[PDB]
Design an enzyme around this catalytic site. Structure first.
Site, PDB file in Angstrom:
ATOM      1  N   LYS A   1       0.857  -1.217   0.000  1.00  0.00           N
ATOM      2  CA  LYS A   1       0.000   0.000   0.000  1.00  0.00           C
ATOM      3  C   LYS A   1       0.885   1.257   0.000  1.00  0.00           C
ATOM      4  CE  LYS A   1      -1.125   0.241   4.894  1.00  0.00           C
ATOM      5  NZ  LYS A   1      -2.216   1.016   5.538  1.00  0.00           N
TER       6      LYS A   1
ATOM      7  N   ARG B   1       3.546  10.141 -16.628  1.00  0.00           N
ATOM      8  CA  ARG B   1       2.642  10.632 -17.697  1.00  0.00           C
ATOM      9  C   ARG B   1       1.763  11.773 -17.156  1.00  0.00           C
ATOM     10  NH1 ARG B   1       2.727   4.646 -20.377  1.00  0.00           N
ATOM     11  NH2 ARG B   1       3.432   5.351 -22.439  1.00  0.00           N
TER      12      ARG B   1
ATOM     13  N   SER C   1       7.214  -1.619  -9.313  1.00  0.00           N
ATOM     14  CA  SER C   1       6.914  -2.860 -10.068  1.00  0.00           C
ATOM     15  C   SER C   1       6.806  -2.524 -11.557  1.00  0.00           C
ATOM     16  CB  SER C   1       5.666  -3.539  -9.575  1.00  0.00           C
ATOM     17  OG  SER C   1       5.476  -4.776 -10.260  1.00  0.00           O
TER      18      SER C   1
ATOM     19  N   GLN D   1       8.950  -3.859 -14.521  1.00  0.00           N
ATOM     20  CA  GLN D   1       8.238  -4.716 -15.499  1.00  0.00           C
ATOM     21  C   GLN D   1       8.611  -4.261 -16.922  1.00  0.00           C
ATOM     22  OE1 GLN D   1       6.907  -7.288 -16.457  1.00  0.00           O
ATOM     23  NE2 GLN D   1       6.469  -6.257 -18.401  1.00  0.00           N
TER      24      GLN D   1
ATOM     25  N   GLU E   1      19.639 -36.166  19.261  1.00  0.00           N
ATOM     26  CA  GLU E   1      20.971 -36.765  19.528  1.00  0.00           C
ATOM     27  C   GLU E   1      21.712 -35.936  20.589  1.00  0.00           C
ATOM     28  OE1 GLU E   1      24.069 -36.634  16.435  1.00  0.00           O
ATOM     29  OE2 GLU E   1      24.599 -38.703  16.980  1.00  0.00           O
TER      30      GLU E   1
ATOM     31  N   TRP F   1      22.224 -43.893  15.151  1.00  0.00           N
ATOM     32  CA  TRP F   1      23.046 -44.948  15.806  1.00  0.00           C
ATOM     33  C   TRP F   1      22.522 -46.378  15.611  1.00  0.00           C
ATOM     34  CZ3 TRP F   1      27.688 -43.848  18.283  1.00  0.00           C
ATOM     35  CH2 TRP F   1      27.956 -42.481  18.484  1.00  0.00           C
TER      36      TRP F   1
ATOM     37  N   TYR G   1      30.014 -40.643  23.498  1.00  0.00           N
ATOM     38  CA  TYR G   1      29.965 -39.190  23.768  1.00  0.00           C
ATOM     39  C   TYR G   1      29.362 -38.879  25.150  1.00  0.00           C
ATOM     40  CZ  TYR G   1      30.993 -38.297  18.774  1.00  0.00           C
ATOM     41  OH  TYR G   1      31.599 -38.230  17.562  1.00  0.00           O
TER      42      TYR G   1
ATOM     43  N   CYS H   1      33.732 -39.630  16.056  1.00  0.00           N
ATOM     44  CA  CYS H   1      34.216 -38.831  14.894  1.00  0.00           C
ATOM     45  C   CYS H   1      34.576 -37.406  15.380  1.00  0.00           C
ATOM     46  CB  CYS H   1      33.199 -38.843  13.742  1.00  0.00           C
ATOM     47  SG  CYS H   1      33.161 -40.440  12.855  1.00  0.00           S
TER      48      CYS H   1
ATOM     49  N   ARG I   1      37.927 -36.016  13.282  1.00  0.00           N
ATOM     50  CA  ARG I   1      39.000 -36.897  12.746  1.00  0.00           C
ATOM     51  C   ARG I   1      38.589 -37.446  11.371  1.00  0.00           C
ATOM     52  NH1 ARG I   1      37.595 -42.245  12.891  1.00  0.00           N
ATOM     53  NH2 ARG I   1      35.881 -42.602  14.369  1.00  0.00           N
TER      54      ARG I   1
ATOM     55  N   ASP J   1      32.725 -37.240   6.451  1.00  0.00           N
ATOM     56  CA  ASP J   1      31.943 -37.665   5.268  1.00  0.00           C
ATOM     57  C   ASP J   1      31.276 -36.414   4.714  1.00  0.00           C
ATOM     58  OD1 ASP J   1      30.117 -38.693   3.419  1.00  0.00           O
ATOM     59  OD2 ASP J   1      29.054 -39.888   4.968  1.00  0.00           O
TER      60      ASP J   1
HETATM   61  N1  LIG Z   1      11.567  -3.185  -3.034  1.00  0.00           N
HETATM   62  C1  LIG Z   1      12.132  -2.289  -3.852  1.00  0.00           C
HETATM   63  O1  LIG Z   1      13.321  -2.400  -4.169  1.00  0.00           O
HETATM   64  C2  LIG Z   1      11.311  -1.208  -4.319  1.00  0.00           C
HETATM   65  C3  LIG Z   1       9.957  -1.105  -3.963  1.00  0.00           C
HETATM   66  N2  LIG Z   1       9.127  -0.048  -4.367  1.00  0.00           N
HETATM   67  C4  LIG Z   1       7.702  -0.034  -3.916  1.00  0.00           C
HETATM   68  O2  LIG Z   1       6.854  -0.381  -5.052  1.00  0.00           O
HETATM   69  C5  LIG Z   1       5.692   0.517  -5.053  1.00  0.00           C
HETATM   70  C6  LIG Z   1       5.934   1.489  -6.204  1.00  0.00           C
HETATM   71  O3  LIG Z   1       5.835   0.700  -7.431  1.00  0.00           O
HETATM   72  P1  LIG Z   1       4.450   0.329  -8.274  1.00  0.00           P
HETATM   73  O4  LIG Z   1       3.200   0.815  -7.636  1.00  0.00           O
HETATM   74  O5  LIG Z   1       4.522  -0.315  -9.634  1.00  0.00           O
HETATM   75  O6  LIG Z   1       4.624   1.873  -8.931  1.00  0.00           O
HETATM   76  P2  LIG Z   1       5.831   2.521  -9.921  1.00  0.00           P
HETATM   77  O7  LIG Z   1       6.807   3.304  -9.109  1.00  0.00           O
HETATM   78  O8  LIG Z   1       6.264   1.502 -10.953  1.00  0.00           O
HETATM   79  O9  LIG Z   1       5.007   3.773 -10.633  1.00  0.00           O
HETATM   80  C7  LIG Z   1       4.131   3.637 -11.771  1.00  0.00           C
HETATM   81  C8  LIG Z   1       3.914   5.032 -12.394  1.00  0.00           C
HETATM   82  O10 LIG Z   1       5.144   5.500 -13.059  1.00  0.00           O
HETATM   83  C9  LIG Z   1       4.754   6.079 -14.350  1.00  0.00           C
HETATM   84  N3  LIG Z   1       5.104   5.236 -15.546  1.00  0.00           N
HETATM   85  C10 LIG Z   1       5.225   3.914 -15.624  1.00  0.00           C
HETATM   86  N4  LIG Z   1       5.534   3.602 -16.881  1.00  0.00           N
HETATM   87  C11 LIG Z   1       5.607   4.724 -17.590  1.00  0.00           C
HETATM   88  C12 LIG Z   1       5.888   4.939 -18.875  1.00  0.00           C
HETATM   89  N5  LIG Z   1       6.147   3.858 -19.594  1.00  0.00           N
HETATM   90  N6  LIG Z   1       5.906   6.178 -19.397  1.00  0.00           N
HETATM   91  C13 LIG Z   1       5.630   7.264 -18.546  1.00  0.00           C
HETATM   92  N7  LIG Z   1       5.340   7.016 -17.207  1.00  0.00           N
HETATM   93  C14 LIG Z   1       5.342   5.744 -16.759  1.00  0.00           C
HETATM   94  C15 LIG Z   1       3.248   6.291 -14.232  1.00  0.00           C
HETATM   95  O11 LIG Z   1       3.005   7.488 -13.413  1.00  0.00           O
HETATM   96  P3  LIG Z   1       1.741   8.440 -13.623  1.00  0.00           P
HETATM   97  O12 LIG Z   1       0.838   7.950 -12.546  1.00  0.00           O
HETATM   98  O13 LIG Z   1       2.302   9.779 -13.377  1.00  0.00           O
HETATM   99  O14 LIG Z   1       1.283   8.153 -14.999  1.00  0.00           O
HETATM  100  C16 LIG Z   1       2.835   5.035 -13.508  1.00  0.00           C
HETATM  101  O15 LIG Z   1       1.491   5.154 -12.993  1.00  0.00           O
HETATM  102  C17 LIG Z   1       5.734   1.181  -3.647  1.00  0.00           C
HETATM  103  O16 LIG Z   1       5.113   0.316  -2.670  1.00  0.00           O
HETATM  104  C18 LIG Z   1       7.234   1.315  -3.429  1.00  0.00           C
HETATM  105  O17 LIG Z   1       7.611   1.530  -2.057  1.00  0.00           O
HETATM  106  C19 LIG Z   1       9.681   0.916  -5.191  1.00  0.00           C
HETATM  107  C20 LIG Z   1      11.016   0.808  -5.553  1.00  0.00           C
HETATM  108  C21 LIG Z   1      11.856  -0.262  -5.203  1.00  0.00           C
HETATM  109  O1  LIG Z   2      29.312 -37.630  13.401  1.00  0.00           O
HETATM  110  C1  LIG Z   2      29.773 -38.286  12.469  1.00  0.00           C
HETATM  111  C2  LIG Z   2      29.977 -39.706  12.480  1.00  0.00           C
HETATM  112  C3  LIG Z   2      30.487 -40.297  11.390  1.00  0.00           C
HETATM  113  N1  LIG Z   2      30.854 -39.595  10.261  1.00  0.00           N
HETATM  114  C4  LIG Z   2      31.355 -40.361   9.112  1.00  0.00           C
HETATM  115  C5  LIG Z   2      32.790 -40.104   8.694  1.00  0.00           C
HETATM  116  C6  LIG Z   2      33.168 -41.455   8.099  1.00  0.00           C
HETATM  117  O2  LIG Z   2      32.642 -41.648   6.789  1.00  0.00           O
HETATM  118  C7  LIG Z   2      32.507 -42.409   9.090  1.00  0.00           C
HETATM  119  C8  LIG Z   2      33.342 -42.751  10.300  1.00  0.00           C
HETATM  120  O3  LIG Z   2      34.052 -43.987  10.047  1.00  0.00           O
HETATM  121  P1  LIG Z   2      35.512 -44.238  10.674  1.00  0.00           P
HETATM  122  O4  LIG Z   2      36.249 -42.963  10.362  1.00  0.00           O
HETATM  123  O5  LIG Z   2      35.289 -44.537  12.148  1.00  0.00           O
HETATM  124  O6  LIG Z   2      36.094 -45.431   9.932  1.00  0.00           O
HETATM  125  O7  LIG Z   2      31.301 -41.732   9.503  1.00  0.00           O
HETATM  126  C9  LIG Z   2      30.676 -38.212  10.160  1.00  0.00           C
HETATM  127  O8  LIG Z   2      30.973 -37.521   9.168  1.00  0.00           O
HETATM  128  N2  LIG Z   2      30.145 -37.645  11.297  1.00  0.00           N
END
Ligand SMILES: NC(=O)C1=CN([C@@H]2O[C@H](COP(=O)(O)OP(=O)(O)OC[C@H]3O[C@@H](n4cnc5c(N)ncnc54)[C@H](OP(=O)(O)O)[C@@H]3O)[C@@H](O)[C@H]2O)C=CC1
Ligand SMILES: O=c1ccn([C@H]2C[C@H](O)[C@@H](COP(=O)(O)O)O2)c(=O)[nH]1
Ligand SMILES: NC(=O)C1=CN([C@@H]2O[C@H](COP(=O)(O)OP(=O)(O)OC[C@H]3O[C@@H](n4cnc5c(N)ncnc54)[C@H](OP(=O)(O)O)[C@@H]3O)[C@@H](O)[C@H]2O)C=CC1
Ligand SMILES: Nc1nc(N)c(-c2cccc(Cl)c2)c(COc2cccc(OCCCC(=O)O)c2)n1
Ligand SMILES: Nc1nc(N)c(-c2cccc(Cl)c2)c(COc2cccc(OCCCC(=O)O)c2)n1
Ligand SMILES: O=c1ccn([C@H]2C[C@H](O)[C@@H](COP(=O)(O)O)O2)c(=O)[nH]1
Lengths: 522, 526
Positions: A34, A107, A142, A146, A299, A321, A347, A407, A427, A430
Site C-alpha cells: 500500500k 505521464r 513494479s 516490469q 541426539e 546410531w 559421547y 568422529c 577426525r 563424510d
Molecule cells: N523493493 C524495492 O526495491 C522497491 C519497492 N518499491 C515499492 O513499489 C511501489 C511502487 O511501485 P508500483 O506501484 O509499480 O509503482 P511505480 O513506481 O512503478 O510507478 C508507476 C507510475 O510511473 C509512471 N510510468 C510507468 N511507466 C511509464 C511509462 N512507460 N511512461 C511514462 N510514465 C510511466 C506512471 O506514473 P503516472 O501515474 O504519473 O502516470 C505510472 O502510474 C511502492 O510500494 C514502493 O515503495 C519501489 C522501488 C523499489
Molecule cells: O558424526 C559423524 C559420524 C560419522 N561420520 C562419518 C565419517 C566417516 O565416513 C565415518 C566414520 O568412520 P571411521 O572414520 O570410524 O572409519 O562416519 C561423520 O561424518 N560424522
C-alpha cells in the site's frame, strides 16, 4: 545493445510473500505494500543501496563516453530512474536523492529542474545521450521494473534477498533464467531481525611489472568433468558462507587422493581443512539441499543427559546410531558381551562421566567420573579467558568398548567481549552425508552453551582431519555444486532455558529456512 | 627515463654458499658463489634449470606494443623472444647441445673473439654501450643478463639492472668467482618464493628491485589495534610472501592488527585469536624458523623422553634441558595442589599418556610396563597394517588425569594420514604462545613426523599445525615487530640415521639439521 552502451542496471530488494513448500528465485519477489516498503526498516539494505547508486569511478568514464559518442556521434554522478508512485513514497531530507541525477518517469507530472521528468522509456535513452553520468540505476516500482525488463534495457540486476515474509501488493517480475544468470552472491548478514544477502544477475549471451613475477613463481604448477560444474565455475564472487563447504567438495573432487574403504566403497580424501561460520549473522543450515534437524537435536539432548542407550533414540524414530548397535555390528567389534543398542562409553558417557568404569547402559553413574560438561560451563562463567575450556569424547582407555570411536574428538571454547566461539575437531569427515548435519549439531550446541552462560554466540569453527567424498556421492555432489545457495535461516532458542540440562525438543525453532530440493546422496 | 626501464634489462643468477659454524653470522652475502674452475660450483640442480628456462623464455605478446611504444618514444621513432646476454667465459662453459639458448636471442660480450669465431646464431658485442644500440634495433620482450661474474659486476655498478632474479642455493661448494655484494640502498628484496628441495639441496627464489565495481559493492560493509602499524615497513613492502615461514609471520601480523586484548594466567595480557591452520611440506624442507636463531638439542631430548614414557624432570635437567624446570618446582607443584608430588615429578604428562593412557599414576620411578594403553605402539601398527584407517590418533588430553599433571598438555593430539607411501600429521594445539612456544612446537612435531615415517617405511609429506587459542604476549610485541621485518632464508634439511627401524631406538646423535641459515637470536622478553 542499448543497456551495454548506456549501462542501465536495476537495483531492488525483494522479501518473501504470504499465501513441503518448494523454493526458487521467485520465492524472493515482494517489493511494496500500500504505497510503501513491506518491511519496517532494513539498514544494511539502505546502506548497500546508497553505496551502489552513489559509487562512481571517474578514471573509468573516458571509455563509457567514447562508447556513448561513437554510438550517437561526436563532478561525475550516476543517474537514478523512479516511477511516480516510487518517487511519492520517498520522504523529504533524502527526496532529491543526494549526489544522483534524479530522473522520474511520469505521464501526469512535469516542471523543478536539475531534476528530469520523462513521458516514455524511449525519452530516457535520449536524456542519457545528452548527459555526463557514470551508470544508470532503475530504482523501479513494479511497473518501471516490469517495462525495462520487457524491453531488454537491463545489463545487471543488483537483487537484495530479504529472508523474511511480509504482506505485499506489488511484486518484482519473474526473471527468466534464459535471459539473466546469477554471477555473484554476497556474504549472509543479519540486519533488523532478518537475514539477507546480495546477488547479481547479468544479461546472458543469447607498474604492473609484478604480473610477470606472479608467472615465474608459478613455474612448478581427477576424472571429474568441470564442464559439469558450469554454474559453479561461471560464478565470479562466491562469498556466501555455504561456499566454505562447497569449495571443499570441489577441492576433494578435483585434487583428492583415490583410496579404498572398509567395504571397498572408495573415497576421494584430503587432510586438514578449517571452515568458520558467523553464528551472530546466520544459522549455517545448508540451503543447496533439504536438511532435517529433529534427529540432530534429539541426539544432542541424549548426549547432554549422558545416555548410551540406543533404544531411547530408536523409540523416537532417531536412527543415526541404529546400524552401530546391531548384534552383527557389536560382534564384528568383538563386543560379544554387549546388549543390542548398548553403544558403550560413547559421547554422553565421556561428557558426564569420563574415567568411570562402564558397566551397562542401565547403570546409575551419578557422581562417577569427570562431569566435563558441567566443568566447561563453570570455566566459561567463572574463568572465561581460560585456554583449557575443552570437552573431549576421545577416551583412549574406553575406545575399544565403544560401538565406534567418536568422529567429533573435542570442542574448545573461546570467550571475548561477552561472545562465545567454538572449535570442533573432526577426525573423519563424510563431506556428502555427515558434515552438513555435523555443522548444524555443533552450531546448535554453541548456541545452547552460549545462552546458558549468558553470552552471545560468535563463531563455529570446524576443523576437518580425514576429509573424504564417497565415490557414490560424486554425481549427487555435481548436482549440488551447480545450485546457488539461499540466505541462511536463523535459530531461535526458548530464552527461558538457563541450564544446559533443561532443553527439550520444543525449545528449538528454525526460521526462514529456504532450500533447494532434497538430494538422495547415493 | 632510465636505460634499464626502457630496455627492461634484468639479471638472473644462482648463488650457493662458499668455504671458510659455531656462532656463525648470516646476511644476504652468504649466497654469493657463482662458479668454480670456469663451470658451476654444483653438479645438476634441475629445479633451478627449470626456473631459469621459464623466466628467460616467457613473453606476453599482448604487452609488447606498450613496450615498443615506450622504446620508440625514448629513441624518437613512431614469435616474440627475450634477449639473453652472456660473458664469453659463461658462453664457453655452456654444453654444445644447449647453444645457442633455444627460443632466445643470444648475445655474447667479448673483446678476444669476433663473429668469425662462432658457428651459431649469436650477436657478438665488444662493449656494454653496443648492447643498448642493439636493443634499440631489435624486436624483443625483455633482456636477461645471464652473467659471468665480470658481466654482473659491470651491469650492476652502471645501474643497468631493473631487477635481480636470485636463486639461493642453500648448500656449500668450492667457488673461485662470486656475485657482487648487492648494495641494500640500490636494490631491495620485493619477493620470496616457496622453498623447494632439488638434487639433495633446498633452494628458494627471491627478486631484488632497484630502489571490479562489483568487488567494490560486495565490500560496502568493511568496518582494530593498529596500535603499532607501519613499524612493519619491510614486511609490508614485499609483494609475494610465498616462503612457508610467512604462514607463521602472517599469523603474528593478524594477531597484532586484529587480535583481542585479554588477561591470562600470569596476568601479563595477550592479544588472542581463535582457529588457524599452517601446513609445511617436509618432503621439500625442515621448517625451522630462520627469522630468529633456534636450537633443537633440547626439543629432541624432550621428544626422546616423551617416547621413553618418562615423567622424571631430573632426566632432562641432567642433560642441561630446562624446558620443564619451572613446572617442576615445590612452589609450582604446591600452587597446583600437588602437595604430595616430589620436585620434578611432573605427573601423568605426555610420555605417560603416550605409553600408559588409563594407568593409575603413582610416581616418576614406578615401572608401568604393560599398564594402560600404549597408544604410540598402536598408531605405529595402524600406520603399518591399516594405513587408510581414519582412527590413527595419539591423544595426550586425558580428562581423568589433567589435575595430576604439572600442567595440562597444550599439544592435545596428533592425527596421521597415509597416501601413496607418504605420511602426513595434523597436530591440534589448544594454546599457542606465538612468540616463544610455536617456533619450537613446529620443529618438535615435524621431527616426530619424520621419526614415525621412517619406522613405518614411509616418506614424510605434510606437517599440519592447527592453532586453537593463538596468543601474542604484550611483552613480546617489540621483539616480534623486529622479527617480522626480517626476510626468511631458505629452510634447512633434517637427516635421520636410516638404521633406526623402531620408534624407541632413536638417540640425540641420530638427528642432523644441515644448512640452517638464520637471523641472530632474539630475546622475546625485551
Ligand atoms: N523493493 C524495492 O526495491 C522497491 C519497492 N518499491 C515499492 O513499489 C511501489 C511502487 O511501485 P508500483 O506501484 O509499480 O509503482 P511505480 O513506481 O512503478 O510507478 C508507476 C507510475 O510511473 C509512471 N510510468 C510507468 N511507466 C511509464 C511509462 N512507460 N511512461 C511514462 N510514465 C510511466 C506512471 O506514473 P503516472 O501515474 O504519473 O502516470 C505510472 O502510474 C511502492 O510500494 C514502493 O515503495 C519501489 C522501488 C523499489
Ligand atoms: O558424526 C559423524 C559420524 C560419522 N561420520 C562419518 C565419517 C566417516 O565416513 C565415518 C566414520 O568412520 P571411521 O572414520 O570410524 O572409519 O562416519 C561423520 O561424518 N560424522
Ligand atoms: N651461478 C650463476 O648464476 C652463474 C655462474 N657463471 C660462472 O661464472 C664463471 C665465468 O664468469 P667470469 O669468469 O666472470 O667470466 P664472464 O662470463 O663474466 O665473462 C668474462 C668475459 O666476457 C667478456 N666481457 C665482459 N664484459 C665485456 C665488455 N664490457 N666488453 C667486451 N667484452 C666483455 C670478456 O671476454 P674476452 O675475455 O673474450 O673479451 C671477459 O673476459 C664460470 O664458472 C661460470 O660457470 C656464469 C653465469 C652465471
Ligand atoms: N536494494 C534496494 N533497492 C531499491 N530499489 C530500494 C528502494 C525501494 C523503494 C524506493 C527506492 Cl528510491 C529504493 C531499496 C530500499 O531503500 C530505500 C527505500 C525507500 C526510500 C529510501 O530512502 C532514500 C534513499 C536515500 C539515500 O540512498 O541516500 C531508501 N533497496
Ligand atoms: N638462476 C640461474 N641464473 C643463471 N644465470 C644461470 C646460469 C648459470 C650459468 C650459465 C648460464 Cl647461461 C646460466 C643458472 C643456472 O644455469 C643453468 C645451469 C644448467 C643448465 C641450464 O640450462 C641452460 C639450458 C636450459 C635452457 O635454458 O634451455 C642453466 N641459474
Ligand atoms: O609446548 C608448549 C607449551 C606451552 N605453550 C604455551 C602456550 C601458553 O602461553 C602456555 C600454557 O597456557 P595455558 O596452560 O595457560 O593454556 O604455554 C606452548 O605454546 N607450547
Amino acid at each position: 545493445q542499448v543497456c551495454d552502451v548506456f549501462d542501465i542496471y536495476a537495483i531492488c530488494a525483494c522479501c518473501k510473500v504470504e499465501s513441503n513448500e518448494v523454493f526458487n528465485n521467485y520465492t524472493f519477489r515482494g517489493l511494496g505494500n500500500k504505497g510503501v516498503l513491506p518491511w519496517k526498516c532494513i539498514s544494511l539494505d539502505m546502506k548497500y543501496f546508497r553505496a551502489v547508486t552513489t559509487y562512481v569511478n571517474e578514471s573509468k568514464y573516458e571509455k563509457l563516453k567514447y562508447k556513448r559518442c561513437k554510438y550517437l556521434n561526436k563532478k561525475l554522478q550516476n543517474v537514478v530512474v523512479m516511477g511516480r508512485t516510487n518517487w511519492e513514497s520517498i520522504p523529504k531530507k533524502f527526496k532529491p536523492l543526494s549526489n544522483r541525477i534524479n530522473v522520474i518517469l511520469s505521464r501526469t507530472l512535469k516542471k523543478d529542474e536539475d531534476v528530469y521528468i520523462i513521458n516514455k522509456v524511449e525519452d530516457l535513452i535520449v536524456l542519457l545521450g545528452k548527459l555526463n553520468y557514470y551508470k544508470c540505476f532503475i530504482l523501479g516500482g513494479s511497473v518501471v521494473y516490469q517495462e525495462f525488463l520487457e524491453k531488454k534495457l537491463i545489463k545487471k540486476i543488483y537483487f537484495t534477498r530479504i529472508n523474511s515474509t511480509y504482506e505485499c501488493d506489488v511484486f518484482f517480475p519473474e526473471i527468466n533464467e534464459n535471459e539473466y544468470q546469477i554471477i555473484s552472491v554476497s556474504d549472509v548478514y543479519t540486519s533488523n531481525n532478518t537475514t539477507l544477502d546480495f546477488i547479481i544477475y547479468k544479461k546472458t549471451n543469447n607498474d604492473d611489472e609484478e604480473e610477470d613475477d606472479f608467472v615465474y613463481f608459478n613455474f612448478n604448477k581427477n576424472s571429474i568433468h568441470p564442464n559439469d560444474f558450469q554454474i559453479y565455475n561461471s560464478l565470479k564472487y562466491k562469498y556466501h558462507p555455504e561456499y566454505q563447504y562447497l569449495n571443499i567438495i570441489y577441492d576433494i573432487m578435483m585434487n583428492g587422493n583415490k583410496q579404498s574403504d572398509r567395504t571397498g566403497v572408495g573415497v576421494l580424501s584430503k587432510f586438514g581443512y578449517i571452515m568458520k561460520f558467523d553464528l551472530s549473522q546466520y544459522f549455517p543450515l545448508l540451503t543447496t539441499k533439504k536438511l532435517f534437524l529433529r534427529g540432530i537435536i534429539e541426539e544432542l539432548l541424549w548426549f547432554i543427559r549422558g545416555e548410551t542407550n540406543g533404544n531411547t533414540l530408536l523409540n523416537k524414530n532417531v536412527r543415526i546410531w541404529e546400524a552401530n548397535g546391531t548384534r552383527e555390528f557389536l560382534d564384528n567389534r568383538k563386543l560379544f558381551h554387549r546388549e543390542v543398542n548398548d553403544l558403550g562409553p560413547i559421547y554422553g558417557f565421556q561428557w558426564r562421566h569420563f574415567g568411570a568404569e562402564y558397566t551397562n547402559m542401565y547403570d546409575n553413574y551419578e557422581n562417577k567420573g569427570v562431569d566435563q560438561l558441567k566443568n566447561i560451563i563453570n570455566l566459561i562463567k567463572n574463568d572465561p579467558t581460560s585456554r583449557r575450556i575443552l570437552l573431549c569424547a576421545w577416551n583412549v582407555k574406553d575406545l575399544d568398548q565403544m560401538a565406534l570411536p567418536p568422529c567429533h574428538i573435542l570442542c574448545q571454547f573461546y570467550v571475548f567481549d561477552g561472545k562465545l566461539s567454538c572449535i570442533m575437531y573432526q577426525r573423519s569427515c563424510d563431506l556428502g552425508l555427515g558434515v552438513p548435519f555435523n555443522i548444524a549439531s555443533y552450531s546448535i550446541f554453541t548456541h545452547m552453551i552460549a545462552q546458558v552462560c549468558n553470552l552471545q554466540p560468535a563463531q563455529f569453527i570446524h576443523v576437518l582431519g580425514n576429509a573424504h567424498v564417497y565415490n557414490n556421492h560424486i554425481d549427487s555432489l555435481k548436482i549440488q555444486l551447480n545450485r546457488i545457495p539461499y540466505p541462511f535461516p536463523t535459530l531461535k532458542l526458548n530464552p527461558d532455558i538457563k541450564n544446559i540440562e533443561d532443553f527439550t525438543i520444543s525449545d528449538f525453532t528454525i526460521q526462514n529456512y529456504v532450500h533447494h530440493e532434497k538430494i538422495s546422496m547415493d
